[PDB]
Amino acid sequence: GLTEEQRMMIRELMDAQMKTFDTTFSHFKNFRLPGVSREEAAKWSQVRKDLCSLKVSLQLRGEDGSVWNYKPPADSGGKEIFSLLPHMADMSTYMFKGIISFAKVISYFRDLPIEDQISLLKGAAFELCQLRFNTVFNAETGTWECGRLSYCLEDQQLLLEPMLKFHYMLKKLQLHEEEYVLMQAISLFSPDRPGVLQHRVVDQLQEQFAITLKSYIECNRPQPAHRFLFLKIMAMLTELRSINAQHTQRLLRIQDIHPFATPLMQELFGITSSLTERHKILHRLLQE
Amino acid sequence: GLTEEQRMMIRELMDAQMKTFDTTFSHFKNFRLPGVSREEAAKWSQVRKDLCSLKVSLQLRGEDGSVWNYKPPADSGGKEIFSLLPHMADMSTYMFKGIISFAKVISYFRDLPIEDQISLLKGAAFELCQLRFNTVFNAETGTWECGRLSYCLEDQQLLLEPMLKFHYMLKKLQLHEEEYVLMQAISLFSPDRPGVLQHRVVDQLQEQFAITLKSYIECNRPQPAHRFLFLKIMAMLTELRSINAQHTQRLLRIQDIHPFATPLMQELFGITSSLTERHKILHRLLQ
Ligand SMILES: CC(=O)O[C@H]1CC(=O)OC(C)(C)[C@@H]2CC(=O)[C@]3(C)[C@H](CC[C@@]4(C)[C@H](c5ccoc5)OC(=O)[C@H]5O[C@]543)[C@@]12C
Ligand SMILES: CC(=O)O[C@H]1CC(=O)OC(C)(C)[C@@H]2CC(=O)[C@]3(C)[C@H](CC[C@@]4(C)[C@H](c5ccoc5)OC(=O)[C@H]5O[C@]543)[C@@]12C
């Protein structure tokens, strides 16, 4: 059995997840929709590879049963490849606000100095976003099922995209809600994000989330399908950190030649004195 | 061959058609799109019948190669069934303006008194719209191809709807452009529309268009096998008159419980002193 502190810890994380993850996306509104020669050669070739890996069609089900479907242009060579970027920025921004609320509700996060709160969220927002997205990923259809919104991979050869491989591999672990939310906490409380000052405090917090996860698995996963599950999850978290870094770089290349990121995204990802001045939205959201 | 008069009359109609039928729908813009308790319940049950006979899906192909597609809901029970009415009011209004412009170009129509011009257009506008829609109808895919915009039947049992049976049958006749525009003229110059005063003058003009059509077919098509093509065309026109009456009743019932018609549609369909004063937009458009 788990200890009382471990049971209480899982209860609090799960309560926070339920309060701050709009899994039906009911309150995601007012978003944008696609309308109805030197080193620049190499910059465009890269950004074209970057966006082609991120290629999905979009579905919007009306309350009535009606369905709008958007298929992106099939090409790659001009401003047509950027047509979903405003929408993607709005969705991402909505998800990031839910993750910021997730952190704020957690006692262990609330008590950190506000500058470390900023640094941890800068370091983890994309990671916790993928973890939440994975819970609504349908691996059979290659579709993220977001309430009335659906994102469907265009189309083996897609497993070559580390982002997509992550989602398929994580889904195959068949994790419980408790295990997702402990992955979120472990990634959130990463002691070695840039700018974090209380390394030792955050590190001791992370270690207790990891011990709670390992213990949860031991009490609830007797089957041989789940041998080494704890260590697989920890490896997946290390992979998520690498995919995080590849995205930060990917986003900056796209932003350079085609601005699209929202102000909160620019703050989270470093797009241009002290930590609190340079992140006024994050600072405001944390004081609320 | 045709008489030189007949040849000139066909050329006038072809020129009017060329000037006023935006066959690619390039200038249909700014249209609306479906957003992202006694006798009254008996009115709703009839309007539900009226609307589900008028259900298509909507496709919009962007210039960049992207495609937006809209599927309408199942009837259920509520205002969801009205979701495409604003868009259709915009399509119809666009098509009606092109038909008013069509009529205006034609010497034989221009020479009629303004009140009969109004009456003939009120009587025939919907018919000429369907004749023009037929020319962009793809019978194999059940789709009206309107440039970058398509209306697709969803789906044998749809041949039960007179409107759809009309488009499939007319398409099967494989008419020439010249035969369609003569069909438009014969429908437009119908003497028996409500309010027409110069019945005999209009009847004689219609007969000259019918005679021109009959002779066109005699002279251009391989005599036998097209033996009764003219009469088949005339029977399609009769059927179009009845579809026009059914749709007017349909539109009026829908309008009553869910207003959607544009001002021009209100004038054309009688939706509320002299015929001019009750049709100020039509009057303006004709001068
Ligand atoms: C692979 C991809 O296309 O991802 C698409 C669809 C998809 O296949 O899977 C998931 C769910 C993983 C993926 C999650 C995700 O992270 C978002 C929401 C993303 C859309 C584009 C980006 C990457 C956006 C960006 C960055 C640069 O150009 C756009 O940057 C962001 O921070 C995030 O919005 C995302 C989404 C929906
Ligand atoms: C069967 C149907 O779904 O018809 C659809 C699609 C279709 O399959 O075929 C065509 C293309 C011929 C057909 C032509 C047509 O006439 C319009 C534009 C119509 C939509 C509804 C109506 C009838 C509208 C009305 C009246 C009452 O409620 C709306 O009134 C009007 O005057 C016209 O807009 C029309 C349209 C697009």
Author numbering:
A (entry chain B): 142 to 177, 192 to 310, 316 to 432, 446 to 461
B (entry chain A): 142 to 177, 192 to 310, 316 to 432, 446 to 460
Give the text the authors published on this PDB structure.
To further confirm the direct binding between nomilin and hPXR, and discover more information on its structure and activation mechanism, we expressed the ligand-binding domian (LBD) domain of hPXR (residues 130–432) fused with residues 676–700 of nuclear receptor coactivator 1 (NCOA1676–700) at the C-terminal as a co-activator peptide. The purified hPXRLBD-NCOA1676–700 (hPXR chimera hereafter) was co-crystallised with nomilin and the structure of the protein-drug complex was determined at a resolution of 2.1 Å, allowing a detailed observation of the drug-target interaction. The hPXR chimera forms a homodimer in the purification and crystal structure, as previously reported. The dimeric hPXR forms an interface via the β1' strand of the characteristic antiparallel β-sheet. A region of non-proteinaceous electron density was identified in the Fo-Fc map of the LBDs of each of the hPXR protomers, and the molecular framework of nomilin fit the electron density very well. The electron density in protomer A was refined with better continuity than that in protomer B. The binding of nomilin in the hPXR chimera was majorly mediated by the hydrogen bonds formed by two carbonyl oxygens with S247 and Q285, as well as the strong hydrophobic interaction among the backbone carbons of nomilin, and the cavity formed by a series of hydrophobic residues including M243, W299, I414 and M425. Two methionine residues, M243 and M425, closely contact both nomilin and rifampicin in their crystal structures, respectively. In addition, one of the structural differences between hPXR bound with nomilin and rifampicin is the helix formed by amino acids 193–209, which is well-refined in our structure and previously reported structures of hPXR in complex with SR12813, clotrimazole, and hyperforin, but absent in the structure of hPXR-rifampicin complex. However, S247A/R, M425A/Q and W299R completely blocked the activity of nomilin, indicating that these amino acid residues are critical for nomilin-dependent hPXR activation.
In mammals, pregnane X receptor (PXR) is a major regulator of the expression of drug metabolism and xenobiotic detoxification genes. In mammals, PXR is a major transcription factor for regulating the expression of phase I–III drug metabolising/xenobiotic detoxifying genes. Nomilin is a naturally-occurring compound in citrus fruits such as lemons, grapefruits, oranges as well as in tangerine seed and peel. Here, we show that nomilin is a PXR agonist, and may extend lifespan and healthspan in C. elegans and mice via NHR-regulated detoxification functions, and induce the common transcriptome markers seen in the liver of mice in response to most lifespan-extending interventions.
